[PDB]
Predict the structure.
Amino acid sequence: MRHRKSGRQLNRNSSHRQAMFRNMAGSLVRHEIIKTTLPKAKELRRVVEPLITLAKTDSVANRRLAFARTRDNEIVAKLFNELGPRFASRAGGYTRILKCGFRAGDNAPMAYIELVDRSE
Amino acid sequence: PVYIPRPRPPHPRL
Amino acid sequence: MIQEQTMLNVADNSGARRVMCIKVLGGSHRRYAGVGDIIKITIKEAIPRGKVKKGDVLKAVVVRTKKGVRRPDGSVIRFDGNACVLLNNNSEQPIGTRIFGPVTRELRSEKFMKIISLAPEV
Amino acid sequence: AVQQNKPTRSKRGMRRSHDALTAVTSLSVDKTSGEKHLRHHITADGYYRGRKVIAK
Amino acid sequence: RSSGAGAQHVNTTDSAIRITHLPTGIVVECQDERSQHKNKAKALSVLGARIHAAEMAKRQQA
RNA sequence: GCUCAACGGAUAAAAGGUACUCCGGGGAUAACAGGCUGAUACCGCCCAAGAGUUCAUAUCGACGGCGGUGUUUGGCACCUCGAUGUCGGCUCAUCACAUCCUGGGGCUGAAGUAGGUCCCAAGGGUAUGGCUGUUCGCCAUUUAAAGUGGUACGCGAGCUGGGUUUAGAACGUCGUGAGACAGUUCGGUCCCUAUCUGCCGUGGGCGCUGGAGAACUGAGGGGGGCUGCUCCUAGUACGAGAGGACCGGAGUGGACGCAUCACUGGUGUUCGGGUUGUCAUGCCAAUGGCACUGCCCGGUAGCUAAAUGCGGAAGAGAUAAGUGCUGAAAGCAUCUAAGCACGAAACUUGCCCCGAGAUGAGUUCUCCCUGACCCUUUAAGGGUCCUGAAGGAACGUUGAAGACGACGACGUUGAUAGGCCGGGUGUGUAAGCGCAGCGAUGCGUUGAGCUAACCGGUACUAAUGAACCGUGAGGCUUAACCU
RNA sequence: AAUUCCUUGUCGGGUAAGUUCCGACCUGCACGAAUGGCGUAAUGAUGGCCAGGCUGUCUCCACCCGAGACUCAGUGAAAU
RNA sequence: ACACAGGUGGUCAGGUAGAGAAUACCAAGGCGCUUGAGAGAACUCGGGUGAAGGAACUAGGCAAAAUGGUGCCGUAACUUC
RNA sequence: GCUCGCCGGAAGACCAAGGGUUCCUGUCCAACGUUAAUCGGGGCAGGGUGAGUCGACCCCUAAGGCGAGGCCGAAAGGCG
RNA sequence: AGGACCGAACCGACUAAUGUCGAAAAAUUAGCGGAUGACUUGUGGCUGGGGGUGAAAGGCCAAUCAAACCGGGAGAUAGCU
């Protein structure tokens, strides 16, 4: 009856769910805007924001904890150097959701999930 | 159809 | 929690070693016993020098539980093994003259006075 | 599972009486462009609350 | 109904007509066959035979 | 010239098995059941010898008889052979009282306890293991009790298949044999996605008529109603002694049901740590992927009980059995014929829940609507412009609410969800560095690091300004009231 | 006893309690010596019983993880 | 009868760990198995765990749970040795 | 194209048997693929199969078939 | 040496579940028994219907067997629906 529980199952086991959250968070860090379904973006708000929260302070061990997630060197290289000193003033809530119609393949609620960016 | 199967083995009632 | 077909160790030196609880006495349709409730047991193993033989069907009282007994302060007392004291079926008056292991304070009411008097701890 | 007799056209119509789809009929007007869009959804060109939020 | 085997009729209707004595405590059983009243006659004949046997045995011992 | 004796004689000439079977059929005809009756069965009553120290009627009761039920076997085949699945077991029960206990009473061959019998009363409860497939029976131990029956001896489109009746094989018996045995034993595929009624819940439309937001009253319906043990009274009454009260009160138990994580646990594959085999990050370290969550160790919040409280009532009305008061018929007597006062877990309340779709549609409070016109079958009529009011609906954030609907909170005049800070909790001295040791490894920084669903704050992000439905004060008749 | 109706015939063991089992008693309805009898090491997805460990089988179920069942978009039956 | 969880003979056949063509992860190579997206109700399947008992459940230890590998010590009745 | 996951004594690569162009390219989708379909083992058109050394052809042979004459048998035919 | 033991390929289906208008007109999942011989399998032949074959079930003989299928007697017969 899931009283006071959080965490969307998304019709997948925890291995595939964690792996696709890893890959989708890496894609959102790399491309700065992606287009997916709505609850995946809702749960990716609980994934990307702790990554940026860990990326607030640059050190030796924080790079290893940010490499323990996203399993990639280019993603942690874009972290702590580009996103770090640019999201320094804002405290939390670095993402943004945009509902964009429905997909023509299966009628699913679509959403552009992005960061507060692209003023380059 | 071509093949119509043998029906279900019924209740004994013997 | 002592229910039917439960193997228990004998706390006193009456002679039996392993007993089997066959029915929780007191009240119909009762699942399991409590702190100092009366149970009916049979004897599965005994010493040759015991006062009772193997196969005697008699009443006993539980003194130590692995489920634990609850003091009214909020604490629980869990023992590492079930234990019982054998009783003589119309007047309780236990057979063993020395009792090994501690007991619980809620056993002390007017009929188990000899058990807690012979108890070495608590 | 197996029915006794078939239902009617009337029973089918009274069953499909609650199958009528509901239209939203609540299309909004953008502040800058004025294009038609749904509630809390962006337009076809990416307009939302006047700001170019898609930047594309 | 009785115990035994082989018929739809075997289960449904009873065929064990055990006769239990009050003053001696003997039960005669002819869960025997087909129906319960011929089994009653069989169980009464067994009662009479066992009474005659148990009395003539005591007389031959008297 | 035929005991062609099946004798109006089918051939002059003919026995058996089929559970390996197969076809056309039949309820013309059986088994399981439903139907009619009640020989049988169970229970109740009439008469009365007699048993009982006397004494038929405390309790029994021969010889005899009359009745009730359809619970057992029976009898007939009325329905079913173009198919009604039967026994026993598990779960789920429902109803009657011919009541097993609890409750209220009468008699007693009832000194008290414990009893025997009978009446009213179905509100509640009405075992656990061994054997046997067994219902049943016996044993062992409880209990206040281990009730009888119906409902297709309830329940297989809820479940097995142990037994019984498909095909295999055997033991004993019969038959020359095939084969048979209600004589066992070994083993042997039990289908169906719910159209209708019903039940458990949950919604849409419409109605109650001007609409809406709430608050309830309440018809009626539903849930529950079990009681042991100990103590006081009180060792009191009673009783030679032993034994041992009625009524009343209090505490502690078992089951049932409800509620909740405050304690103790379980789970907690979203949290942390240890470790094995392999692979990857160019390599050490560190981390991640797979092998059932890899193996485990714990463990946040939620769910859950084995955890903790709660309740069965007290009280009132009307009563059944029964006990009565006054009291004639009938100068007496009499509980009844007139009347009155008692009298049970049975009935209605009183305890709790649903509930005005109770179309008989209830009551109260509040909010909101007071703009012109033509056509006319001048009809509770239709049409145009302007306005959309209270409120509702749609969307989003969402919930200890939820299959979906529905319900609750919030929508920038903000703490509804996500993020962030701090605290709490859990795992347990992260990485890096420095020191000791040839090394694994050990110590200091450090009881650190990481923290999900928790708490208190913080608009950092997302809930946009708006559009949609719903209207111009509301029908006829009668009376009372201010004009 | 794969035999046995009476029968759960009788005694002892195993269990507190055993129509099953074991060792016998022979009152063998209706065992029996090549349609073979009695034992027999080893063996058997063989029939039955008991003993230890082990556990959700049960007492008494509780939570969690995936696949369906619930909703939406597309295709779309069947017995009757 | 299908773009079907069935069946079909022979040859080559590596790295680590391993007694091994077993099993766990990989190289060369092909794939993600022609319906997806939500929510995480009752009920169904494959599983995991569980306080206390340990077969009391059932016709029946059926199913589940438990043991499990290398080296060494030692191993009873009986027997056709 | 980037990563995640599966087999790896195979879910990899060659053939035999069996299919009969299903191979590739261009183009298209009305029918098929249990969903879109610009994709295809689907429709249309074009191309592709190169041997003294691979296999088939050829020599001989087992099991076995036919079998001049020959034996038997109403005929058909059977044996050899 | 073993109609030896455990255990892969392979052969078969002993238990339980999933299915049971199924993925399939016998299958799959988790456990199984044999697995150097009375084993399994490919290729090509032989034995055939009152017959063939059978480590023997009255089984199998092209998903049909106490007498296969096809065509003809035959529009058999049917006091039966």
Summary: Residues 39 and 51 of chain E are 18 Å apart (CA to CA). The longest helix of chain E spans residues 36-60. The two ends of chain E are 41 Å apart (CA to CA). Chain E has two helices and two strands.
